[PDB]
């Protein structure tokens, strides 16, 4: 645990940076905040709270930013389905094939 | 020109897939829908327009989802500074220094 980002490094979500003197701790937590410690006691932070923030980035073209992970918005639920391939047919219903048979079709 | 997605493969911003007869065409839009056309008629659409839609992808575990992409939050807003660091001082301040001094800090 290091005092530094250089341009192209990146805090993900646990890790952080720690002062030279081990007093203060910028830590990237799981809750999608980006706190700043004095001795267990949180003197700032990016209030993002309650956020899916995934990484915290000093990127080239010149600024920190803290991102959201990408964010599913539509899906077929149909996890845990082995070897799927999706296809349209020409009768026109979109299949989503698997290794016992049809997972999910519109129909 | 393809209509199949196997495991892993996925559908990016403006891809498509057509049918065999060629008659339907399954394609991602830059608007964020993923519709399914029948010739210039939309038979079926996911709703998901209005949406920062990167992705469609047929996953290996076997679920079909659809990813809206990394969104940034919070930044600290120094674009086009040059040679950039953050640091975590022992005076406690943070400061993301630049090529020409400090860009960002808390005073
Ligand atoms: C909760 O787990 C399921 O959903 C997420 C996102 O919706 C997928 O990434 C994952 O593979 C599963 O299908
Ligand atoms: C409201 O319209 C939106 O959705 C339809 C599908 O229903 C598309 O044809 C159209 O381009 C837009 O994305
Ligand atoms: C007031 O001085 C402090 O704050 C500035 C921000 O302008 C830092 O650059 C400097 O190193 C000190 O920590």
Request: aromatic share 8%; hydrophobic share 35%.
């Given at each position: 645990?290091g005092?530094?980002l250089?341009?192209?490094q990146?805090?993900?979500?646990?890790?952080?940076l720690?002062?030279?003197?081990?007093?203060?701790?910028?830590?990237?937590?799981?809750?999608?905040?980006?706190?700043?410690?004095?001795?267990?006691?949180?003197?700032?932070?990016?209030?993002?709270n309650?956020?899916?923030?995934?990484?915290?980035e000093?990127?080239?073209?010149?600024?920190?930013?803290?991102?959201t992970?990408?964010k599913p918005?539509w899906?077929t639920?149909?996890k845990?389905?082995?070897?799927?391939?999706?296809?349209?047919?020409?009768?026109?219903?979109?299949?989503?094939?698997?290794?016992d048979?049809?997972?999910w079709?519109?129909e």
């Amino acid at each position: 645990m290091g005092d530094t980002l250089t341009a192209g490094q990146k805090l993900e979500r646990g890790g952080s940076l720690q002062s030279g003197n081990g007093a203060y701790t910028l830590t990237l937590q799981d809750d999608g905040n980006l706190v700043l410690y004095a001795r267990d006691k949180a003197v700032w932070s990016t209030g993002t709270n309650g956020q899916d923030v995934v990484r915290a980035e000093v990127q080239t073209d010149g600024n920190f930013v803290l991102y959201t992970a990408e964010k599913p918005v539509w899906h077929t639920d149909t996890k845990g389905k082995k070897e799927v391939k999706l296809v349209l047919q020409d009768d026109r219903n979109l299949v989503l094939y698997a290794k016992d048979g049809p997972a999910w079709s519109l129909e």
